[PDB]
């Protein structure tokens, strides 16, 4: 499988604590995805979202600071996971979120960029009121 790396950065009008909670609380994920979610907020914990179209495992969870996860869309080759790193930086009580995605199937680059930039980032901002 040819793969690609993406890097996204986005600033949210909330604190790192509140943004980290949004990414790691099953009921908050259900809210901004408009779908049932299962999320085990533990190192080794599994997550399943959006009718199983997104799933994976958390591999590193440092509250308010970073999340590392194995992450996939359901249509990817079975057992193929991207590694997604989320880093939370306090900038004047706003949060600069840095997303790095490695191991994304190359044909799926634009779908995955849209998934993070539009669905996660704009969905979180619209659901919780964290700025434009
Ligand atoms: C990236 C997964 C995802 O993140 C969200 C955040 C807020 C609202 C919906 C979603 C959402 C989806 O439903 C979804 C489902 C499919 Br299938 C996709 O091909 C894409 Br792309 C996105």
On whether the CB atoms of residues 35 and 113 are closer than 8 A, the answer is no
Would you say the CB of residue 126 lies under 6 angstroms from ligand 1?
Answer: no
CA-to-CA dists, residue 15 to 18, 38, 81, angstroms: 5, 24, 29
119 lines ligand 1 (CB under 6 A): yes
φ, ψ for residue 96 (rounded to 5)?
-90, 115
Method: X-ray
Nearest CA to ligand 1 atom 1: 115
Q: What is the DSSP string of 71-115?
A: EEETTSPTT--EEEEEEEEEETTEEEEEEEEEEEEGGGHHHHHHI
Instruction: Write the CA distances from 20 to 4, 29, 63, 95, 117, integer angstroms.
Output: 26, 11, 7, 10, 17
d(CA 24, CA 120): 13
Q: Evaluate: CB of 32 within 6 angstroms of ligand 1.
A: yes
Architecture in CATH for domain 3-128 = 2-Layer Sandwich (3.30)
Decide: 54 in ligand 1 pocket, CB within 6 A. Answer: yes
Report the C-alpha dihedral over residues 100, 91, 114, 28, rounded to 10 degrees: 100
Token readout for 103 is: 């191991």
Contacts of 5 (CB under 8 A, 6+ apart): 100, 101, 102, 104
Q: How far is CA 105 from the centre of its chain?
A: 17
Is residue 123 lining ligand 1, measured as CB closer than 6 Å? yes
Distance 125 CA to ligand 1 centre (A): 15
């Amino acid at each position: 499988i040819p793969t690609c790396k993406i890097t996204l950065k986005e600033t949210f009008l909330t604190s790192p604590e509140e943004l980290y909670r949004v990414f790691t609380t099953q009921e908050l994920v259900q809210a901004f995805t408009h779908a049932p979610a299962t999320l085990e907020a533990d190192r080794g914990g599994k997550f399943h979202m959006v009718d199983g179209n997104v799933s994976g495992e958390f591999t590193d969870l440092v509250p308010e600071k970073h999340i590392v996860m194995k992450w996939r869309f359901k249509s990817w080759p079975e057992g193929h996971f991207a590694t997604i790193t989320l880093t939370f930086i306090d900038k004047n009580g706003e949060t600069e979120l840095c997303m790095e995605g490695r191991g994304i199937p190359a044909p799926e680059e634009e779908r995955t960029r849209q998934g993070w930039q539009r669905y996660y980032f704009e969905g979180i901002k619209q659901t919780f009121g964290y700025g434009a």
